[model samples]
Target chain A: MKILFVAAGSPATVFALAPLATAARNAGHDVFMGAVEDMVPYIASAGIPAVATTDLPIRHFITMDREGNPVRMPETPEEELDFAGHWFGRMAAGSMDALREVTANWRPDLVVGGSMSFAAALIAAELGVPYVRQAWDTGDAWRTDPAASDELRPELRALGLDRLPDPALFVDICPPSLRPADAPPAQMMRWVPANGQRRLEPWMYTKGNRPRILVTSADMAALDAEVVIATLVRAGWVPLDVVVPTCDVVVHHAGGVTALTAMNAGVPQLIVPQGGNFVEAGLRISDFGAAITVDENTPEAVEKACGELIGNPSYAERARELSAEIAALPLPAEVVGALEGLVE
Target chain B: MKILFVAAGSPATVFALAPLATAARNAGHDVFMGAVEDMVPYIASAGIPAVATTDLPIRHFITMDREGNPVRMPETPEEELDFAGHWFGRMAAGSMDALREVTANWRPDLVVGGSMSFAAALIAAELGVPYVRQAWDTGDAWRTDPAASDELRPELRALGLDRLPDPALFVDICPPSLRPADAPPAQMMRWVPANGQRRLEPWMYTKGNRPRILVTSRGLVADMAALDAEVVIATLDEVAEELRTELPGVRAGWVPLDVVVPTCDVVVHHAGGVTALTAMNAGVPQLIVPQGGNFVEAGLRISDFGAAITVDTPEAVEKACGELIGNPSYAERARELSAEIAALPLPAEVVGALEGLVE
Candidate 1:
């Protein structure tokens, strides 16, 4: 079976699907990743063969308000659907032709798309192939919006499709404890970190003697290293998954993958919510006692949070409990066999 | 279980073991590839995390003869063993410290070494972990010249060991028909082509309207354009300039063999393992020009399989190319070999056998 993984927008979207792509390929299925033009190199870097499906960048559709802020900020339910419809429609319009050409040339047995990659779902519906949606973040964003098909009606009509079809299956990488209570049914897959390629150092395999704090945000760059006894500052693209295990606490922008990676490593976190679903993720992990949210994204506040996280032992204890919860979920390899059963 | 793959020499060695590395990782086993200094990028490019073991380059041991030629060339059976022993000994000695440090820091349940990577077997022996040898070529070279451990006596004795331990198991990637009749007992693994990373064009997925020939040698530069077919020539950097000047009409440069092999109807190569195995898996009839190493033996075995014809002269190459293009039997036999290769146990299927070794 030829499995086509469709990822658009960002490298994070492609990274989310890599473990599954690897699992399918290891199971003897021919796998190819169809990404947007900018993401081809990113996809190839993960060692999956990829082809560019669209030239249009996903950021082109963000319409700004009069105050020069983005208009898609969802405050109400109506605004959320409106934002979903407009964004998913624009993405579908941009990617539909290339997806059509790709699917026509190399027909896929099944198409797997990221949460935001609705074009894959639309194209797979048009080609009459089964589609699966792999969530890119905590499933709340899509569960709350849930208007991608309704928004993509125009693109669907153009492709002779009435509405965007729901995926045959949904793969969720979120641990059950963190997942929303109202979240739809999903097959739980262990989060195998597919952070992009980087060289490894000997120190990465061992934990530091002191309380090591890894600040994964550029905003906290100026903090003194002596605050934590040992500090490692990194940008977002660094392989945090490898670094988390050696650290006593991680301070970050509360990106879903980063938060989850810290959870998996059993390290307590101090989340400085940058924006979007990050605020929700920060609060939720705080409720789980695995992390604490810093509403004020100041250096002092970050330092204070780091100090509290290191001083507190209960945070680490709760993180270990969450880590056990995550470990109990089906590994991507185990879910791969179950996914194959879904093809028919 | 944690599995470590050791590849010391070239990118080709790492490429040979990529499928197994990927399979092990996908099987929920922790995987790391320990290589020499320069091979880190190659291993990382294949999306596997790697640690550099030694700073010494593998080419440091290739001593030139008085005539400005490599002394390791196998002219006689005794020279072959001598060459294997000397080369493997030097590699093992140079890579020992780094391999020792790596294994001590992160102990692996099993170590997998490429056929020529003697360090892995030695390190695994020292650590009391099982090691598996994955053959790099047709299995004849290692089977015939089995002096790898015998040559490493000095290094072994230094580690409080007298003789190098034999691998707990050997893995053969060659199809049964092409394997030597006297080959040692081994587990067979299906050859999945991992020819490194490269972009693919849509035309690559479609068959050419005319006869498509892929030339993977620099020796056949001038005759490429006149071959009466659309040609794709891939060669080393040294030959790229010469080929570009001489055969301007042909597509010439370094291309991943896995990508170009499936696009061509016929293949002409220098009988390197990767190129030969890639063409075989793609089911394309080949014209092999034996140059060195296992080229002659591999070419002859492939010829016996009726999927390829070995040739010496340019005229013989042209004639063989014609035969490969005009004959249906060669393609048929090539398809048969391809089917056999695909039907063999995949790396995933053989993971059970490896797990059994550790137990």
Candidate 2:
């Protein structure tokens, strides 16, 4: 069975898809990843066959159209999400031809993609193949959906899709209990944490005698982890899998993968949210009592929030509960089997 | 359970351990690789945790002993093999303290090292933990074991042994039929190919109408297994253009050997460890040109196995490519080798067997 996986160009975005893609390949199915040129090495290096679909960068997709007309840029927080889907929608618009070209001879048994990578949805529609949506992180990325409809109007018409078709199967990595009450229906698969591979240092996996803190800065957020390590003295840079588990408190510019990674490890967090769904995810994490949310990054602000997390027993207990909730979800291999059943 | 893996600095040797490392982690064990700093990108990029124990060059580590005496220099293939053991022995000797320091804090339940990574044996002995030898292709390196023992004499005596202890488990990846009559008895495990990662191209994974051939080289010499080898002659596209004139429209160019080799009708490479093993696994006949470092043995071994053709010169590569494509038996025999590998226990199954050691 050929499983074609489409991913946006972010290393984090492609990394999120590796666990499922690898499981599919390990099960003896032929697997290939289609992404922009920027991700070819990443996707290829992760032990998957990769095909380049476009050379466009993420900013280019979100910034302009084919004619280099600068698209509407978001100002307010509300507008940020409204424009997020367009980032992915225009992505679908950009890569459709190349993806369509490759699927000509090597049509996949099923088309799977990241939650926001709408190209998979469009490609599956064009081929009349079952589309599988693998959730990227939190449910908030979907809030950008309506805005994308306008951006995708032409691509939709070309595929004879009046609107983006509902996925034949939606594989959710978000823990069910952690998701909001209004979260969309989907199959809950365990969020296997992958924060890029590293040749691990000894200190990464085992902590010294202290309340170990891990600082992870993502996207455009600029929180220097080394400063945090020096200031806190017990902290250092982070790996969502090994390093995060050994951490006592994770301080980061709130990113969904970060929050979910910490949540999976049963580690409490102090989120210094900057933008996108990061602030929103931080709010939910704070509401769940698994984390502390600060409006911005300052040494004092980060220190205090982290202090509260370390001093409060409730935060650690609540985080551990979420970790258990995530662990109870079906493992990725089992989910891969279910995805395979969609083909046969 | 924590599985500590040890290896020499070569990227190809470390790659052989990734399948087992990945499987060990997926099975809920803590897996960490200890190697020279040279393998950092190769180790972590594959999603495995790597610990750098030393930064010395492969030869520099064993040039002088802890006693500051240079060993007698090597003169023959036999001496180099003897020296190769000493070469790897000092690699172990230099890394011993670092490995010991890490193991003190984060102890491993089992030490699994490449067949040549001798440090794992000493460390496992110190901890009284079981040491497993993971074969790094056919067992030619072990001929140097007697040499390592002499250079490693003081260290071995300290561990209360006159010789290196036989590994409690020897995990062999060589296909049983392909292994020589004199090959050591080993618990056979399957080979899973893992070359370095790259942002993949469409052609890297897919093929054209013409029979595709990938020319992998380091300048005029051929050894694609060395991940970062610089191509001075633009060997990929250079050989590619040459082959097109001869084959008349056959698809040929630089391709990912791990992924593209299976899609290829023929692959041209030096008989490097992981490179040879990858083509051998894919059931694709190879045009093996012998180059440095075990290249001759690997080429001759597979050539005798009937799955490959070993050639002497750059000029011989083109005709051998023709012979491989024109010949039917090479492909069939390669397929048989591939079939043998497919039937053996996968890395995950080997992980299950290792679980017994801790129990």
Candidate 3:
């Protein structure tokens, strides 16, 4: 079987699909990643072979290439999500020509896309192939799917699709305990973390006895770790999966993968909610008791939250429980069975 | 278990070990790779997370870097093998320091190395860990083992040993029929082909009716396959430019030969381990214009076995390829070898055997 996955957005969405792709290849299915040129490096770093389907990054559509009418700022949060949907749809619409052309030469038996990588479904529909949607944590943004379809009216019309096609299956990485009550039912897959590999040093693996903190953020490369005044390792350069276990607390701007990987390692988290999906992810993990979401946007508030989480044992205990819950979900190799059934 | 594989030489050596490493990661084992800085991108391209043990290439020792002592070009075949024995030992000596330091922080349950990646044995000894030696086609150069250990005398003395430690198990990729008569007893593993992947174009996957001829060269010429049955050269961009200047009739571009080889009526290569092995797997009769002892040995081994022709020069090479395309015996022999390759233990099955090393 030929399996093609759409690697879009950031490494989190791209990395999330890696474990499954590797499993499929090991099972003797020919697998290749169809990605925007920007995502190729990230996909290749994870060891999967990839083909760049579009030279344009997804952001080209998000900002509409700054050519035509500038998108107006939305007044309400609901309108904000709706705006995001239309742009995501435009991005998917823009990517379709290349995606269709590539698949015409190398047709696949199945297509898997990141939960928000809208083009996978369009390409699948064009080929009349079954597609799988892989969900990121809790997936609060899935609320935008309908709006995305509404925005893709021109592309859908061109393809003779009345609406965006629904995926035959949805694979979710979020552990059931942290899922929103209204979140769509999805087949659970245990998250296996990967990042660009670098040489490991002694300091990276073994830490000192101090209350060691691993600090991560969207601005991590620029932000000095010394600002927090705790024993800290600037996290991005090292392997997060290996270092998280040795840390006392993970203070991060809740990126989708970071939020879940910390929970998987059974470490306390002080999440400085970095807007959008980050806010929803932090709030849910806070509700689950493994982490606290920072309400005040200040260095003082983040430090305060970090201290409280590290000083307390209860946070770590709840984290252990979350870890147990995560450990019980199906491994990526196991979930390959479900995908096989879908393709069959 | 933590399994650290040392990817020692060219992309070919590293690529051969890829299926095992990927299988290890998929089976839920903690896996990482160690190589020199120059080789890091190649390792990374294979999708294996690797750390640089040194900032040197293996040729540095083989050339001895042209410093105080300029290496003499070998006058005899035996001396050439001896020279290789000494250089591979030099590479292990250069590789061992960082290999030891990294594992000191992140220790492994097992170590696996290329058949001649000598550091695996020395480091396994250094850490008191078990190691496995993975064979390349027939492991023709393993005859250098005694000499390799002999060359590593200083390093072995420091490690409090008189000889280099032996692998706990040796895994062979050579099919039983093609293995040398005097080959050491070993476990068999089916060879799984891999290489630097490229995007496929329509021409690469589809071919016309002319019996296709795929040519691969080291000068960086046609790294790609052609849609025309006329000719395909596995090459480099410069070679593609150079080829068009001299030969007007050839088609040149980049395509994954693994996908294109099965469609080829004949393959012309330098007995490059990966190219030869891939051609064998595809069951394409070969015309080998070999350049070195290892290359010549591989060429002779296959030709002697009736699966290929070992020839030199443009005219004889052209003649050999004509025979390769027309001879049914060559194609049958190549197909039999591929059948034997398919019948051996796969990388997944060998995972259990590797795991047995720790227990």
Candidate 4:
């Protein structure tokens, strides 16, 4: 079967769908991927036939022209209203044209999209094809925005659909043990293990002597790590022996794989949940007693917490217990099977 | 009648399409626009309903998880071979998905597009809707590349079409007086006058006491004045009253638009047909700054010999601007060129072709 998998342009989508694309190819199915221009090479590198969507050229906000010249500012609220509405409308039309172009030929049997590209559902409906969305982390949109249900209703009607699937029908790719909430949505199809794409080197895989500490901030661009790097080195905080070498506890901003990997390596974790979702991910790890949380805005508080995680042995013990649970997950083959079953 | 005008995600696309959308509405047609996410607000500002293709989340690129980090490198040729094909296929599919979503409810009687979004032609074919393409300038795919014919043939076939349209069918939006090149391999259209949206403001629109010199080196950014507002302010030592009074440096790289366009009588600009067209339309003579590539030099030749003049150095600019000061012939000849362009049918001619599609 020819399956065209549409990935959301996100890091998590790459992780969830890359392995699945490979697994599909291995199963002797013709798997293709579609992404934005930037993502084309990455999807193709994973050994799949991928296409770049030239459908819509991305627009950039020129708050100021190149000369640091500000765009002519609107004077009245009405002018501002006009400017804002114009931008929204043009973007909407451009996105539609792009979608129309991609589905012009080689119409696939099934379309699977990342959660970001909600338009994938619309495409499947238009082409009379079955489409599924791949969600990472908690997938509820309406829960976060009470008015979301109303906003989606019009778009859904345009797709010729009446209702959303029961929450049970949604699928969570992560193992149940890693589920942060009370229960997975009923719309969820099944639980699968995270794809293992190790970021660190093989030699640095193990914990080191002393208070081995891994210091990471979620966005290397947004957060300067010079101070964190300096403080860790001064405290003799060795990075994980596998990647950077020398570390007992891993300190990082609340990121999914970063925290999970540290746990999988049986290293105590110190997290600063900067993003709202990052905080949620952090709270879950704390529930497992495998990690400690810190206030990201306050550097001194983060540094102080890092010292305790390194000094404490119980932190490591809790991490080891979590690792054991993570280790029992099905191998890549089983996870692939569950994914195929969901699509079927 | 309802029309969906598609714009390639370019800045000019924003400027040109805004008026066309307004004109189409004034013509009693319900006009909608489709664009990439970035231009969403621009179109919305024009009071036209629009949809963004990027609203549908699709992967844009996969780099070494550390893309900007020191460790990032180009994928090996072998790795690139594997990776490049997948992304191409993925983008095609993702864009198609997004397009399908927007048009599911509202069917356009006609589809209009800018260059680079030729995929809209395929969509038009599938839905049996008439489509038109708005070229920003005279040069297009067929004129620029030899392989474009071969590349487009297979794509045409996939749409279940047999033969391509004659080159004359493609419309050239630039004025013929500027740089008329060979006809394309498809349909053709040209620009219209009276499109006041493309006009420079009235005060800065005229040449001043000195040879009004307009300098625009970079098209992407408007910093020509900002970089040397002092230098420019100094050069106009000959016409200091006009320079200091009408033009003032406001930002790091920009002079107030009033200072840049209205105060200058003649322009020293990159030899892009679009800017040249603007100069011609404004009835102002111009000096051409040619890049060392393509037909830019030819365009410079066409403009300089016909109306103003050409110069490569700063000293030459000072001389040319000085010589052309208060020269009535430059503006007079510019008006004549503008008249020839104003005679051509603008969007109406393109709209006529689209009307055929509707029929």
RMSD per candidate (Å) reads 4.1, 5.6, 4.6, 23.6
**What is the per-residue lDDT of model 3 for residues B1-359, given as tens digits with 9 covering 90 to 100?**
88989877677777778777877765657777877777777777666767777778776878873243767666666776788787778788888878878887789999998877888888888888898988755546386777788878888998898887768988888877767888888878877666666565556655567777788762212322232236766676566777676655566655566567767888888775577787887788988885643355766788888888887554565567668877799999999888888788767677888899899
Please state the CAPRI-style docking class of candidate 3. Answer: acceptable
Off by over 4 Å in 1: A63-85, A144-147, A160-162, A217-237, A276-279, A342-344, B64-81, B217-228, B235-249, B292-296
Question: Against the true structure, what is each candidate's TM-score?
Answer: 0.88, 0.85, 0.85, 0.38
lDDT of 4 at B138: 42
How well is each residue in B206-245 modelled by candidate 4, as lDDT tens digits? 2334333556532211333323222232122245455445
Candidate 2: which stretches are off by over 4 Å?
A27-30, A38-51, A65-80, A101-109, A140-143, A182-187, A197-203, A218-240, A276-278, A297-302, B61-81, B138-144, B180-187, B218-255, B291-299
lDDT of 2 by residue, B82-117 (tens): 777877888888889889988987899999999789
Colliding pairs, model 2:
A40-B199, A40-B200, A41-B198, A41-B199, A45-B197, A198-B44, A200-B50
Query: If the candidates were sorted by their TM-score against the true structure, best first, what order would they fall in?
Result: 1, 3, 2, 4
Measured by DockQ, the strongest candidate is 1
Q: Comparing to the true complex, what docking class would candidate 1 get? A: acceptable
Among all candidates shown, the one with the greatest TM-score = 1
CA shift of B227, model 2, Å? 30
State the lDDT of candidate 3 residue by residue for A1-344, as single tens digits. Answer: 78889867567777778878876765556677867788777776766766776788766766653355667645565776787788777777767877877787778899998877889988888888888998855556376788888998877888888877778988888877777778787888877666656555556666665666777652232323322221323423656766676677887767657777788779898877454334666777888789888754554676677667867899999999988887787877778888889877
